[PDB]
Design a protein around this ligand. Structure first.
Ligand SMILES: [Mg+2]
Ligand SMILES: [Zn+2]
Ligand SMILES: [Zn+2]
Lengths: 99, 1333, 72
DNA sequence: TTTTTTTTTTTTTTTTTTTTTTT
DNA sequence: AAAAAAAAAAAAAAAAAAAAAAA
């Protein structure tokens, strides 16, 4: 048994640190992502990917809402999209958005 | 807040618009202070403040002048995180080519300018002067020159001629191009071109021009003039443990590039000699290429050591590539784990969660409800309270977990049930309890299995976990409709024991009351549990319209049966539980409760059945004593008889009377016979065999032996294994697979021997290893399927089509297994079901075929109904809701959004590991029916079939097909079509071997063109000691006689040439090569005279899906007409088809060794198998078309999966097929740009025809092409996905040059970018967001 | 609450049910506006589902009330 | 009978210890 | 010469030649 709520995080991946030897939470591998996609359940997947993996601002905001008594994610594109967008823009590629 | 994504080549003004200012100085830090040198590589005013809400000058401090650009240091006052996104740019001294478009492989710049890569690189890298508007000179625009040639050109015409060397030359070339003129001339040439390769290259060029025209991009941006610079944080400066700052790896590229560009500016301003500045430009171009993707053009530069350094392009490549990053795997928070433990006393929607793990999952929720209640207002006090285990925190935790569903996920999550979600109830200790019934979908076994607990935080996620995933809303699994909450191991044994007829026991012969007094009788011990007795159960049947009609009456039963009846809800009839409930009748009872009284009563009834099964299983105490594995007393006698049999057979073989192979086969056969005898004996001793007094004399009843009780109940262990426990355990096959001659003659109760046990280890270990391999095999198969299925999502309520396949019961060569019930259940009818009675519409057109309509079909016994199918639904990028049918996880028609691709893929996945790695005797009463019938009375008098692909069916007296057998050609048929054939007739008859040349009419044999010694030989067959004529093939017969074909122009009794009945031409039967013409000349033949005596596991599923063609495909008739053997002896025989309806344009070569079922001249419809053998799928689509490749793939794979034990409903295979063949080759120009050689996604051509026919234009015809799932996944309709499949740089380059906008469609691009997975809640959210706009 | 079958037909889709119930629950959690049906220690979300099954809450009703107060 | 075009089948290229660099 | 940091632990592209077909 190995629980996990907000333990020590990783170095470069910045995900929750994995491994029983360092208070690690169960790995949410691809096949579980398919398992959620089969269900209509989307917010839970979107939160397994962003607000509980790497989004520091999202993590803090969600913690505030939970302790404050509000159950609510913050709608908005994960910052990983923004990092990728700036990465592409480093190259001479428009990579703009749309509607 | 982000609709479809767009990618395009960036204009220089766009790049400068992506910056606040320009970098102009390569500098990192002071090395004394932290000085960010002005215009430095980490310049404060270009990127941001080094410290939050500060100015480098330090004037303003930390909030007051927020967002102020310090008038002195010129720096905004914002957070340091603003430094993460503020892009910069370096203006290039000269235009510099972008390597990515230079080396896309194939280069896009290449065909853009249509120049060889060699010359374009020469001009690019400064070793050749391209010609630019050669004009009135011997040189021309496309021409290039080396240094000597350029010098000579200058000498001869160095007045107006222009030629430059370098990247700027390529830029100038790009300025000099008018793609509209190019479009016109190249389309004209494509019209003129005939060489398919020439058309292909020209259409590559025309697609380039089409891209640049339709896309807003302009080719001159291929040559960069302003290099963007990433914000400093994304290229972190990572200061080393010293005054120096270790400037990353990309920053080094910036150092080199910036220094080179500054020196180039210096040389330009000083105007140094052209050689030096040319070398400088070459170095700058090399440096920029290395910055883009080092290691592509030249040798990659390194860091401190020889070890190479990365590049910006590496950020979009490899495992650390930020495309495939949210797919590898994320260590999600609020996770958990534990070993598992059974959880009776739980309901069917409760998961016993430990205390020590539920105070470390809902910790923040506890903080919230604790500080809010005021028990400890300050947060740190709340933390120290929970860590203090104070009694109040248990109460608060109970409150928060009152209703806060958790998600329990097993390790391999093949199914979509493998992430079911439960409510929590807190136990002590540490083990995630788990309701027993829901141990099936998970597949856990409570022998060390470990499940992970996630939680949903946001309120939407809570509502999802309670609505879409709760364990009480998934009684029906996705693949197969029937329940997957099915009583499994002990509950069924308890139910079985609780209801069994015992001939005489306590409480026999009495009439108690309703069930209540039955339970009272049992508990007091007065009446034994098994007691055939009459009671007064009253059943509330739904006989009236939705009304519980109650009827009561004295009915025979058992006391235990009456006791169990209390758990059945109202609606069910009593007889639902009056048998001895096995594992079959119990699932049937549960399913009937579902269909009759909906869902929630089924959950209540599953709880009750599990509880009242466990309790009475315990009170039974069914225990496996050793003495209850009874062995037959006849076993030793039977084995002695078998031993004597093998002794006599072996002795006879030693005498030579029987060969070794026959002796071995006879030995194994008699061992099998003895094994059958012993198995029957032991199954008869175990079963029945319980003789007991009935209060009068003795009588026998089904036994209560614990082993047999288990096996009959179906608790765990069918007849085979108990046979292995008591009877002979069979003949174990040797490691190769050949069956061992001497079987194991000792059950498990008696001992094995070292030899026998050592033999059994072979089969045991082979089974283990094969399972271990099939694990990964099924894994790979699921991955491919979900890769090619994830695209879809049910996005259209109704496509309003009419082309639904026609489903019929499937007949396995006279063994119809699936009636029309299943393979049309739920799926929506396309055309209104018409009763076999004429003009009697059974059900309307677009109606759902739920169970009652299926019952109506059964009562009318319709043998074929047209059902809409997702294999062809008129939708752009999804699939109609009606055209899909029921969801087969909830029952009602699939609601808008629920992804079916990743439902399908997994349903056709998970049940993969279970997958293992002369005359027809009529057996039923019916009448003869024939398909493709062309027959006639034969000389033998019965019949002869003159058609090749004839099939014989047995139409029952209901006017419905039951049996079906492929009739071979030249078969003896006693009766004919339309004659009564009761169960027992043997009308079909034929030679199982040989390919007789039957002559349908009489006439004297004539050797017209069959010259002996040149085409035929009068060989003396010594088998019968008679002379027979043998036709000689091209090699056997003379080359001069090769033209002399062995024709048989038969002449009738009158001597006139026998014309074929219905044709003017003579019946010149061209016999095949090496044929044995038994008859002689002048022999009067008769009807059908025979003249010439011519002689499973996963891999199959993968081949069917991967469209892997057979190695020796069956060859079909590509067009209808009369066949004609064309030119011969050219390695492969040439064959021509002459459409009798039209011309004879089609001909092709086929191998000589591949035998033909058809003769030289025969009228053959298209699809006629020119040769038999394995059948390819792609040619079926080529000829039969869609709705036939479906009924091939679905039939074949569903047969492979119906082979072992599983039931994969056809919707899933159908959607995988639809995704397989969504691309079609263009058949005509129509009126759009679509060239014939082009192949485009079927949706694109469909909408093209739609919009062309809406106007006066003409649509372009097409031919849909099948693609293997690996091939289809390689094919793409969304550039982000293709990036997810590696070759990222190529995908990005192609998309950018094409301006290829991408839909955020399908569930894999959105996960990568990170928006809402647009399937369920995501799909409704996105449609709502679009609606508000 | 245990099953949600009764709420499916009230908001036919089973996903728009999720988002509508989430809307109502968010209204009832921090947006005040107490539930119109009594609670049994139930979380706000289960009360939202319960009222949806009761039929007195639907996306149309929520939009009507939001517009009415937005006019204020 | 000779040349050119097209096919296809063959080949070749793509968490720990050690090594290289720096003081 | 010692210590510290970086990285290592079959598929398909191209082309020669053989065979088909047209002049
Ligand atoms: Mg196990
Ligand atoms: Zn300042
Ligand atoms: Zn449809």
């Amino acid at each position: 048994m190995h629980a996990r709520s907000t333990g020590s995080y990783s170095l470069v991946t910045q995900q929750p640190l994995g491994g029983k030897a360092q208070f690690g939470g169960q790995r949410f591998g691809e096949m579980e992502v398919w398992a959620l996609e089969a269900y209509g359940a989307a917010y839970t997947l979107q939160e397994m990917l962003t607000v509980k993996s790497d989004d520091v601002n999202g993590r803090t905001k969600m913690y505030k809402n939970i302790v404050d008594g509000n159950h609510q994610m913050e709608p908005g594109m994960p910052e990983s999209f923004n990092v990728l967008l700036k990465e592409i823009r480093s190259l001479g590629i428009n990579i703009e958005l749309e509607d | 807040e982000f609709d479809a994504i767009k990618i395009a080549l960036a204009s220089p003004d766009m790049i400068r618009s992506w910056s606040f200012g320009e970098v102009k100085k390569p500098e990192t830090i002071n090395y004394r202070t932290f000085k960010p040198e002005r215009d430095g590589l980490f310049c404060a005013r270009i990127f941001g403040p080094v410290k939050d809400y500060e100015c480098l000058c330090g004037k303003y401090k930390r909030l007051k002048h927020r967002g102020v650009i310090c008038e002195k240091c010129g720096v905004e006052v914002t957070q340091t995180k603003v430094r993460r996104e503020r892009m910069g740019h370096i203006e290039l001294a000269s235009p510099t080519a972008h390597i990515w478009f230079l080396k896309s492989l194939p280069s896009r710049i290449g065909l853009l300018l249509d120049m060889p890569l060699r010359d374009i690189e020469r001009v690019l890298y400064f070793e050749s002067y391209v010609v630019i508007e050669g004009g009135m000179t011997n040189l021309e625009r496309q021409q290039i020159l080396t240094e000597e040639q350029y010098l000579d050109a200058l000498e001869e015409f160095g007045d107006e001629f222009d030629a430059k060397m370098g990247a700027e030359a390529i830029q100038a070339l790009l300025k000099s191009m008018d793609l509209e003129q190019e479009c016109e001339q190249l389309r004209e040439e494509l019209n003129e071109t005939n060489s398919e390769t020439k058309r292909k290259k020209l259409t590559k060029r025309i697609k380039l021009l089409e891209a640049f025209v339709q896309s807003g991009n302009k080719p001159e941006w291929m040559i960069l003039t302003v290099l963007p610079v990433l914000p400093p944080d994304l290229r972190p400066l990572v200061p080393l443990d010293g005054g120096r700052f270790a400037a990353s790896d990309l920053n080094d590229l910036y150092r080199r590039v910036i220094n080179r560009n500054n020196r180039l500016k210096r040389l330009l301003d000083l105007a140094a000699p052209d050689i030096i500045v040319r070398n400088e430009k070459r170095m700058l171009q090399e440096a920029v290429d290395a910055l883009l993707d080092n290691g592509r053009r030249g040798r990659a530069i390194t860091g401190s050591n020889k070890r190479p350094l990365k590049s910006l392009a590496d950020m979009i490549k490899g495992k650390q590539g930020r495309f495939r990053q949210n797919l590898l795997g994320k260590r999600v928070d609020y996770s958990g784990r534990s070993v598992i433990t059974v959880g009776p006393y739980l309901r069917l929607h409760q998961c016993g969660l430990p205390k020590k793990m539920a105070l470390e999952l809902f910790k923040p929720f506890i903080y919230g409800k604790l500080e809010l209640r005021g028990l400890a207002t300050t947060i740190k006090a709340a933390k120290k309270m929970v860590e203090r285990e104070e009694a109040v925190v248990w109460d608060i935790l109970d409150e928060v977990i009152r209703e806060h569903p958790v998600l329990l996920n097993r390790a391999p999550t093949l199914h979509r049930l493998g992430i079911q979600a439960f409510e929590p109830v807190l136990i002590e200790g540490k083990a995630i309890q788990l309701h027993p019934l829901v141990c099936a979908a998970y597949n856990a076994d409570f022998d060390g299995d470990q499940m992970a607990v996630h939680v949903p935080l946001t309120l939407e996620a809570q509502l999802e976990a309670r609505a879409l995933m709760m364990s009480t809303n998934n009684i029906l699994s996705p693949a197969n409709g029937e329940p997957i909450i099915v009583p499994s191991q002990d509950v069924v044994l308890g139910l079985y024991y609780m209801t069994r007829d015992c001939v005489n026991a306590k409480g026999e012969g009495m009439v108690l009351t309703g069930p209540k007094e039955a339970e009272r009788l049992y508990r007091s011990g007065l009446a034994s549990l098994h007691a055939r007795v009459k009671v007064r159960i009253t059943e509330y049947e739904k006989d009236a319209n939705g009304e519980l009609v109650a009827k009561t009456s004295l009915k025979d039963t058992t006391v235990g049966r009456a006791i169990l009846w209390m758990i059945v809800p109202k609606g069910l009839p009593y007889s639902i539980v009056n048998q001895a409930l096995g594992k079959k009748a119990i699932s049937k009872m549960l399913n009937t409760c579902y269909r009759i009284l909906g869902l929630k009563p089924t959950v209540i009834f599953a709880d009750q059945i599990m509880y009242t099964g466990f309790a009475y299983a315990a009170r039974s105490g069914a225990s496996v004593g050793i003495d209850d594995m009874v062995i037959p007393e006849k076993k030793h006698e039977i084995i002695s008889e078998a031993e004597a049999e093998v002794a006599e057979i072996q002795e006879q073989f030693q005498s030579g009377l029987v060969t070794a192979g026959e002796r071995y086969n006879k030995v194994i056969d008699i061992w099998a016979a003895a094994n059958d005898r012993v198995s029957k004996a032991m199954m008869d001793n175990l079963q029945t065999e319980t003789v007991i007094n009935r209060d009068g004399q003795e009588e026998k009843q089904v036994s209560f032996n614990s082993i047999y009780m288990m096996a009959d109940s179906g608790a765990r262990g069918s007849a085979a294994q108990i046979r292995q426990l008591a009877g002979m355990r069979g003949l174990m096959a040797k490691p190769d697979g050949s069956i061992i001659e001497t079987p194991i003659t000792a059950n498990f109760r008696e001992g094995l021997n070292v030899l026998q046990y050592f033999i059994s280890t072979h089969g045991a270990r082979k089974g283990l290893a094969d399972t271990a391999l099939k694990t990964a095999n099924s894994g790979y198969l699921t991955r491919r399927l979900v890769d090619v299925a994830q695209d879809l999502v049910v996005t259209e309520d109704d496509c309003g089509t009419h082309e639904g396949i026609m489903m019929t019961p499937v007949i396995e060569g006279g063994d119809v297994k699936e009636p029309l019930r299943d393979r049309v259940l739920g799926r929506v009818t396309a055309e209104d079901v018409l009763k076999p009675g004429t003009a009697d519409i059974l059900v309307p057109r677009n109606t759902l075929l739920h169970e009652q309509w299926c019952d109506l079909l059964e009562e009318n016994s319709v043998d074929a109904v047209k059902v809409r199918s997702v294999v062809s639904c008129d939708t752009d990028f999804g699939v109609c809701a009606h055209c899909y049918g029921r969801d087969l996880a909830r029952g009602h028609i699939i609601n808008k959004g629920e992804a079916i691709g990743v439902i399908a893929a997994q349903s056709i996945g998970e049940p993969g590991t279970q997958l293992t790695m002369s005359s027809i005797q009529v057996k039923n009463k019916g009448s003869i029916k024939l398909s493709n019938v062309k027959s006639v009375v034969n000389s033998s008098g019965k019949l002869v079939i003159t058609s090749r692909n004839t099939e014989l069916k047995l139409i029952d007296e209901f006017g419905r097909t039951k049996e079906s057998y492929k009739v071979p050609y030249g078969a003896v048929l006693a009766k004919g079509d339309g004659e009564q054939v009761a169960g027992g007739e043997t009308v079909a008859n034929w030679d199982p071997h040989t390919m007789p040349v039957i002559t349908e009419v009489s006439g004297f044999v004539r050797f017209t063109d069959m010259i002996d010694g040149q085409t035929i030989t009068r060989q003396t067959d010594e088998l019968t000691g008679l002379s027979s004529l043998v036709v000689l093939d091209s090699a056997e017969r003379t080359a001069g006689g090769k033209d002399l074909r062995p024709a048989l122009k038969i002449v009738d009794a009158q001597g006139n040439d026998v014309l074929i009945p219905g044709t003017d031409m003579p019946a010149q039967y061209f016999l095949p090569g090496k044929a044995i013409v038994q008859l002689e000349d002048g022999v009067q033949i008769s009807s059908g005279d025979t003249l010439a005596r011519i002689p499973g596991g996963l891999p199959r599923v993968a081949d069917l899906f991967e469209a892997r063609r057979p190695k020796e495909p069956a060859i079909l008739a590509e067009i209808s007409g009369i066949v004609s053997f064309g030119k011969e002896t050219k390695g492969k025989r040439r064959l021509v088809i002459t459409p009798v309806d039209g011309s004879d344009p089609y001909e092709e070569m086929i191998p000589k060794w591949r035998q033909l079922n058809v003769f030289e001249g025969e009228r053959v419809e298209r699809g006629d198998v020119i040769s038999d053998g394995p059948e390819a799928p792609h040619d079926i689509l080529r000829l039969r078309g869609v709705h036939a490749v479906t009924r091939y793939i679905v039939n074949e794979v569903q047969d492979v999966y119906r082979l072992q034990g599983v039931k994969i409903n056809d919707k899933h295979i159908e959607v995988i097929v639809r995704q397989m063949l969504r691309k079609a080759t263009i058949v005509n120009a129509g009126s759009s740009d679509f060239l014939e050689g082009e192949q485009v996604e079927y949706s694109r051509v469909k909408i093209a025809n739609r919009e062309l026919e809406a106007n006066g234009k003409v649509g372009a015809t097409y031919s849909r092409d099948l693609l293997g799932i690996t091939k289809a996944s390689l094919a793409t309709e969304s550039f982000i996905s293709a990036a997810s499949f590696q070759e990222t740089t190529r995908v990005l380059t192609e998309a950018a040059v094409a301006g290829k906008r991408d839909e955020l469609r399908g569930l894999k691009e959105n996960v990568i970018v990170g928006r809402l997975i647009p399937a369920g809640t995501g799909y409704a959210y996105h449609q709502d967001r679009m609606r508000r706009r | 609450r245990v099953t949600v079958q009764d709420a499916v037909e009230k908001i036919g889709n089973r996903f728009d049910l999720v988002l509508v119930a989430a809307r109502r629950a968010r209204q009832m959690q921090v947006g005040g506006k107490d539930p119109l049906v009594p609670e049994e220690n139930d979380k706000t979300t289960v009360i939202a589902l319960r009222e949806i099954e009761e039929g007195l809450i639907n996306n149309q009703i929520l939009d009507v009330r939001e517009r009415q107060e937005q006019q204020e």
